[PDB]
Design a protein around this ligand. Structure first.
Ligand SMILES: O=C(O)C(c1ccccc1)c1ccccc1
Length: 126
């Protein structure tokens, strides 16, 4: 169902949270080789997460679950914010710009954390 497909999406999001927090520890410890690998894994996860969300949104659309569609439109907009901050974070790492990387990392945490409450309402709605 759409509901189980969103449970799967949610788990992938939780994976990225876990990897993000390991990455943050690695950054604080100055282990750049690890961070690079974690950043690559994060991009794969976010790309997967978005694809699962899009298919779930289109399926709630075809099913006429208007309340779910509204919430998912809002969530996928906030997803793009996350994606833009993430991509800038990656670019700062490549550039060797630790102040920006810190800033984008702090800001991405808050986007994600704030996005968690909408995530939970989508669960109940589907
Ligand atoms: O996929 C997620 O778990 C997040 C995310 C993080 C970084 C880049 C893109 C998306 C997220 C955060 C807030 C709202 C929706 C999605």
């Amino acid at each position: 169902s759409v509901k189980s497909e969103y449970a799967e999406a949610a788990a992938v999001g939780q994976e990225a949270v876990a990897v993000f927090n390991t990455m943050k520890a690695a950054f604080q410890n100055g282990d750049k080789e690890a961070v690079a690998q974690y950043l690559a894994r994060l991009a794969s996860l976010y790309t997967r997460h978005e694809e699962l969300l899009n298919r779930i949104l289109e399926k709630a659309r075809r099913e006429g679950n208007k309340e779910a569609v509204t919430l998912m439109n809002e969530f996928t907009a906030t997803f793009q914010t996350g994606k833009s901050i993430f991509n800038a974070m990656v670019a700062a790492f490549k550039n060797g710009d630790d102040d920006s990387f810190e800033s984008y990392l702090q800001a991405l945490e808050k986007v994600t954390a704030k996005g968690e409450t909408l995530a939970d309402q989508i669960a109940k709605a589907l």
